[PDB]
């Protein structure tokens, strides 16, 4: 292994499922809209874990995926200078990370005002988009609001998935948070501590690749990656990827 067999100061955080080529071959381009929930109750450790989770989730985005980050507490707003799904290249991801690290927790929560913002941003076709795999990531802790009406009105034929994350070590009700994922094609993840940050994003990628599998041999096409530096040092390389079913 390239530099981390057994060496001090040097911890091996490599995980193949997080590499650009794997994330490229494991699913199709996304339209994420990370709904952070910066309300009062998420302050303290839950907020630190939420911002670390959002950064490590933006890290699983390519240049073909489009992303925006919103945050809601009794009213929803974007966290950054962007107001629509922007391409997830290096500079936009850095802007979103710098805006998320500046986020503060205060106020009551309104899930309907946040999901309305999420769906209304995912229905904005005036911008360039990846018209595929529309997603909402809810980085809450827990609550008592399923908001069945807003999903019924905005996401009826279930074009948009909903992945709900219960970030933090707490004891609030996780019933609506586990329900939102079920009714809306999604999956429910738990991130109780730093160390569970790094696997649940890999897992949403695991979920997104079902319709790719159900399209048996149309999906087995070779895709070439952007020019990245190889893990085991040989400089600039591109890599072709083919999923294995």
């Amino acid at each position: 292994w390239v530099d981390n067999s057994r060496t001090p100061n040097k911890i091996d955080l490599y995980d193949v499922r997080r590499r650009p080529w794997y994330i490229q071959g494991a699913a199709s381009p996304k339209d994420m809209l990370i709904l952070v929930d910066v309300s009062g109750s998420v302050s303290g450790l839950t907020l630190k874990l939420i911002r670390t989770s959002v950064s490590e989730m933006l890290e699983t985005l390519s240049d073909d995926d489009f992303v925006n980050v919103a945050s809601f507490n009794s009213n929803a707003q974007d966290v950054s200078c962007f107001q629509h799904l922007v391409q997830a290249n290096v500079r936009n991801k850095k802007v979103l990370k710098d805006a998320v690290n500046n986020i503060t927790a205060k106020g009551i929560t309104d899930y309907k005002k946040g999901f309305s913002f999420a769906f209304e941003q995912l229905l904005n076709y005036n911008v360039s988009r990846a018209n595929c795999n529309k997603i909402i990531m809810l980085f809450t802790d827990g609550g008592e609001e399923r908001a069945q009406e807003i999903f019924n009105k905005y996401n009826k034929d279930k074009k948009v998935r909903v992945f709900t994350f219960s970030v933090g070590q707490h004891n609030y009700d996780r019933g609506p948070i586990q329900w939102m994922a079920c009714e809306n094609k999604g999956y429910y993840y738990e991130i109780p501590s730093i160390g569970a940050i790094r696997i649940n994003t890999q897992e949403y990628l695991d979920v997104l690749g079902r319709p790719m599998v159900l399209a048996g041999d149309k999906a087995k096409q070779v895709q070439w990656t952007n020019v990245y530096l190889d893990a085991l040092e040989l400089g600039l390389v591109i890599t072709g990827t083919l999923p294995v079913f």
């Binding site: 199709s28 381009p29 073909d64 990846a130 595929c132 795999n133 529309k134 279930k158 074009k159 586990q178 994922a181 079920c182 094609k185 999604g186 999956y187 429910y188 993840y189 997104l208 079902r210 319709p211 790719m212 159900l214 399209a215 149309k218 999906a219 096409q221 895709q223």
Partner: peptide, 17 residues
């Protein structure tokens, strides 16, 4: 990209967690 795969009806939604 020209082609992408989402929203397949044969998909098994019973696996939230």
């Amino acid at each position: 990209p020209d082609v992408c795969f989402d929203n397949n009806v044969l998909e098994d939604y019973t696996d939230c967690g």
